[PDB]
What we know:
This is Phospholipase D2. The chain is an alpha+beta fold. It is built from 15 helices and 21 strands.
Amino acid sequence: RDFLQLHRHDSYAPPRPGTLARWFVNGAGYFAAVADAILRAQEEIFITDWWLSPEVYLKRPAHSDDWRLDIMLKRKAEEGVRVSILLFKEVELGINSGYSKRALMLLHPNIKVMRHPDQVTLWAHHEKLLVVDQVVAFLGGLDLAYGRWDDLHYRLTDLGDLSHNQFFWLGKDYSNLITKDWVQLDRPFEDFIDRETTPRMPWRDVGVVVHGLPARDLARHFIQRWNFTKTTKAKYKTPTYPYLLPKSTSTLPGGQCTTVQVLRSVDRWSAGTLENSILNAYLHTIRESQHFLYIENQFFISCSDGRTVLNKVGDEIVDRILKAHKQGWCYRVYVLLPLLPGFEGDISTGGGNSIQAILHFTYRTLCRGEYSILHRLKAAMGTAWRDYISICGLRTHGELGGHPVSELIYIHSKVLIADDRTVIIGSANINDRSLLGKRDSELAVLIEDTETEPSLMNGAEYQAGRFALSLRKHCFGVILGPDLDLRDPICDDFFQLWQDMAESNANIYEQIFRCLPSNATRSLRTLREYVAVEPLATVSPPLARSELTQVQGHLVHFPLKFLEDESLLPPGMIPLEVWT
Length: 580
């Protein structure tokens, strides 16, 4: 189909029936499949990244230079494949796009990198994309960067010429984003945190590969950005940065047949044109949902006031719940968020001002003030709001230094599932920065099942979509931990079990580790005395170990009262839309 007019959800690309698509949870399988695809490239590789670590390993553990990203691209370039890479040019953030650019172009003349933007701005190129030969395209929340690789084990430790290497995270790849931001990226194989005393922060994310026409559509987005970027400065206008051109005619892992529509957020500054079809698809999917939403997202900043926060995703969720309550429907909203935002800040001191600013807008969406979801639900239905929405985070535990240690699982995903039939996967967080179009550039795909499987929905027989059901079950299974019945995602028994597990795990983790965030620290003054206590994990490792046997899965209740007596906004000159 065509690109002369806009399509459903005001997207530049139409929905593509009969598309083979496969989802990925966590970087391990996504980065492996990226590696397989790079290896089979014959003509072109397109890559967009907010951050690209050239020396990251795509398969683990590394035993040689094979599967190292820079080596793989250099080998393909040496066979004649053209590699075109668009990197975000940060305001010297610490991702060091200058080192990434010089390193990638040193590999081979067939590899060309452009960075953008040159002008000072608050916004970023946020999309993560890799397209091979305009026919296979990977996108989602995972950059080809340090700290992203993980698997279902969510290992907190990594204790074991690379011929005898047993580490899964070499050098700068072993990191705890909350503990310390990356330094010295030109020394990639050097540690910057203490492996024997400081645990890893596990990274959870969702990606997707699509084949055929939607991969062509994603290639067309890259090409539009590439040719637009060429015109942005003199060095890039020269023929050494070739114009790219889309394949027009005749458009592999184990995927599922689905209908896929590409969506994006772009503006004049970031591309040639304006679009906010990710937002439109989010709103419409919520509006038309009938049974449940599953939201796993790094951010949750919404509920418009017309001034500070503008996107209406939260408002659509509220309206949907209020309608279900008015009609007597069984309807559930599952929200999975990182327990703490992903910036370097000592949470035992209260978090940095960046963390506190994000916490302000997160809690403003969830439960604090006239616009919050919980306040508007309570106004209509009182304490019944708990039957309709559950806000949770993830946590795991392990052993280091002879005693249990614990860390949150960083929810970096940007995924929505509706009704076991529809999925949105992309780079777009739920905040104004990702969704308005005018700010960060973003990509997503809307994946609608055309093939179904018998399942259940509040006890009734229900034809669920194959792609959506397998993903939703895979999420639930890992989060909850054998004899579990995951067929019905909304019946009372399952929702009760979900809430009971979230609370039970949260209680145990608080009993053993006194981990933050917590409902027990409503102010900074009570936080200061709360962290002054040694947790049982180190006081008595045997007692701690015994109690940790009662933790099931990783699901923990999201504490809605953490620092609720503090203003959490900084007094400072940064415009507030940096955080929204």
